[PDB]
Amino acid sequence: DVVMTQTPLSLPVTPGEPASISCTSGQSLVHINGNTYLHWYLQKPGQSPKLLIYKVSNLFSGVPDRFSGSGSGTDFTLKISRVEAEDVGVYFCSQSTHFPFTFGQGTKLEIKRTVAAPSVFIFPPSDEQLKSGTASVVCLLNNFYPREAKVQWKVDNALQSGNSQESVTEQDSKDSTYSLSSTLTLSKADYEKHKVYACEVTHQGLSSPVTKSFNRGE
Amino acid sequence: EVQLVQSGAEVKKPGESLKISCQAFGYGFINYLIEWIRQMPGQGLEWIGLINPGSDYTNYNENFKGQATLSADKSSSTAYLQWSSLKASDTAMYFCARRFGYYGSGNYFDYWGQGTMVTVSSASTKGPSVFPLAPSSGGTAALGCLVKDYFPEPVTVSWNSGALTSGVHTFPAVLQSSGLYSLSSVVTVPSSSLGTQTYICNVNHKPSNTKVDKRVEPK
Numbered sequence: 142d143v144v145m146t147q148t149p150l151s152l153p154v155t156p157g158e159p160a161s162i163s164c165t166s167g168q169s170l171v172h173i174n175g176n177t178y179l180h181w182y183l184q185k186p187g188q189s190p191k192l193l194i195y196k197v198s199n200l201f202s203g204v205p206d207r208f209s210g211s212g213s214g215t216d217f218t219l220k221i222s223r224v225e226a227e228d229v230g231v232y233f234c235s236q237s238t239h240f241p242f243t244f245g246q247g248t249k250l251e252i253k254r255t256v257a258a259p260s261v262f263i264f265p266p267s268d269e270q271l272k273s274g275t276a277s278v279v280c281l282l283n284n285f286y287p288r289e290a291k292v293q294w295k296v297d298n299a300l301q302s303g304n305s306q307e308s309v310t311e312q313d314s315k316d317s318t319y320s321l322s323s324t325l326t327l328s329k330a331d332y333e334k335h336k337v338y339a340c341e342v343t344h345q346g347l348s349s350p351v352t353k354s355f356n357r358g359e
Numbered sequence: 360e361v362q363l364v365q366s367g368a369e370v371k372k373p374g375e376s377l378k379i380s381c382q383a384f385g386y387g388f389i390n391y392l393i394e395w396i397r398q399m400p401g402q403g404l405e406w407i408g409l410i411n412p413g414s415d416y417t418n419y420n421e422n423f424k425g426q427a428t429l430s431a432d433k434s435s436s437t438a439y440l441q442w443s444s445l446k447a448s449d450t451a452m453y454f455c456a457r458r459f460g461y462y463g464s465g466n467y468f469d470y471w472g473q474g475t476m477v478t479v480s481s482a483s484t485k486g487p488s489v490f491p492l493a494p495s496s497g498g499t500a501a502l503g504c505l506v507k508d509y510f511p512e513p514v515t516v517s518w519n520s521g522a523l524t525s526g527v528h529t530f531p532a533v534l535q536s537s538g539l540y541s542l543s544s545v546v547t548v549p550s551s552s553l554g555t556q557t558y559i560c561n562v563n564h565k566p567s568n569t570k571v572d573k574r575v576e577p578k
C-alpha cells in the first residue's frame with residue numbers, strides 16, 4: 142500500500158506567523174490519467190475530517206486563501222500564510238490515486254503561548270471509596286503550557302510503577318493551557334500499609350520538581 | 360444539501376458480528392462512491408473500502424478483507440458495513456463518506472456521516488460509582504468528582520446542574536484493566552467561597568439509566 146508519512150507530528154503556532162506541514166508518499170501519486178490525487182483534511186476533536194485542498198493545490202469551496210498546497214510526485218506541502226486561532230486541529234494528507242486509498246498519520250497544530258507552570262493538587266481517597274475495598278489517589282496538574290509534563294508517584298519514598306494512569310485535556314480555547322490528571326490505584330489492603338503518598342511533578346515552568354503529599358489520616 | 364445518516368452506537372462482544380447503516384438523501388445514489396473509514400482512539404484514519412451501488416464495483420483494504428463486507432440497497436438508498444469476528448481492537452468510530460465521483464468527473468464532495476461508535480468488549484453494562492475529590496488548603500481551591508467503574512462510554516458530568524462551567528475540566532475516560540472506564544471532573548473555585556457555596560457534580564450514565572448527584576464538601 143502507498144504509505145503516507147507526515148512531519149512534524151506536532152506544530153505549535155503563534156497566530157499571525159506562517160506555518161508549513163509536510164507529506165511524503167512511498168510511491169508517486171501521479172495517476173495514469175495525468176492527475177495527482179493528493180488532498181489535505183483538517184479534523185477538530187469530536188468531529189469528522191473536513192476537506193481543505195484537493196489534487197495538491199485546489200482550494201475546496203469555502204476554504205480561505207491563506208491555505209495553499211504544493212509539491213509533486215512523492216513530496217507535498219500544505220502552507221498557511223498567516224495562522225489564525227481557527228486553524229487548530231489535526232491535519233491529514235489523503236491519497237486517492239491508488240487503491241487501497243490511504244492517509245498520513247496526522248500533524249497536530251496547537252496554539253503556542255508563554256510557558257505556564259501547573260498548579261498541583263493532591264486528593265486522598267474518600268472514606269466512601271475505601272469502604273468498597275479500593276483506593277484511588279488523584280493528582281491534578283492544572284492549566285499548564287507546554288503539554289510535556291512528568292508525574293511520578295512516591296509511596297513512603299518508593300517509586301510506583303504500573304499502578305497509575307494519566308489523562309489530559311484538549312488545549313483550552315481561551316487560555317491555550319492543558320490540564321492533566323494522574324490516578325494512582327491501590328487495593329484498600331495495600332493503601333493502609335503505607336503512610337506518605339506523594340505526587341512529584343516535573344515541568345518546564347517549574348525551577349525544580351514540585352511535590353504535593355499527604356499522610357494517610359490527618 | 361446531501362447528508363449521510365448512520366445507525367446508532369453499537370456495543371459488541373468479541374467474536375460477534377455487526378452491520379451498520381449509512382442512509383443517503385438526494386437523487387442519484389446509484390452513482391455514488393461511498394467509502395468507509397474508521398478512526399481509533401484519538402488516532403489515525405483507517406480506510407476500509409469503497410462501493411459503487413450502481414454496479415458490482417467494490418474495493419477493500421486487504422487487511423480487512425473477510426472481516427468487512429460492503430453492500431448497498433438501491434431501493435432504500437442505504438449503504439451497509441458488515442464486520443465479522445469482531446475483536447477488542449476493532450473498537451472505533453466508523454464513518455461513511457462521499458468524497459469523489461468517477462475519475463475525470465471534476466467532482467469533489469465532502470459528505471461525512473456523523474459516525475457510528477463501535478465498542479467491542481466482554482464487559483457488561485454497569486453504572487458508575489461517584490466519589491468526592493474534596494478541597495483542602497485566600498486564593499483558589501480545586502475540587503472534583505471521581506467517576507469510577509462504568510461501562511460503556513459515555514458519561515456526562517455537569518456542576519450544580521450546569522450552573523457552573525467556568526474553570527471546570529472534565530478529563531477523557533481511561534479504560535482500566537477490569538474493562539471498566541474511569542474519569543475525573545475537577546473545578547477550581549475561590550477559597551473564600553468554600554464555607555458558603557455548595558458544589559455538586561451531576562453524573563449521568565445513559566446506558567445504565569444512572570443519575571447521581573454527589574455533593575463535594577471540605578474534610
Ligand SMILES: CCCCCCCCCCCCCC(=O)OC[C@@H](O)COP(=O)(O)O
Pocket residue numbers: 176178196237238392411414416458459460461462463464465466467
Ligand atoms: C466503467 C467503470 C465504472 C466503475 C467505476 C466505479 C469505481 C470508481 C472509483 C473511482 C475513485 C475516484 C477517486 C478520486 O480521486 O476521484 C476524483 C474524481 O471525483 C474527480 O477526478 P478528476 O479530478 O476529474 O480527475
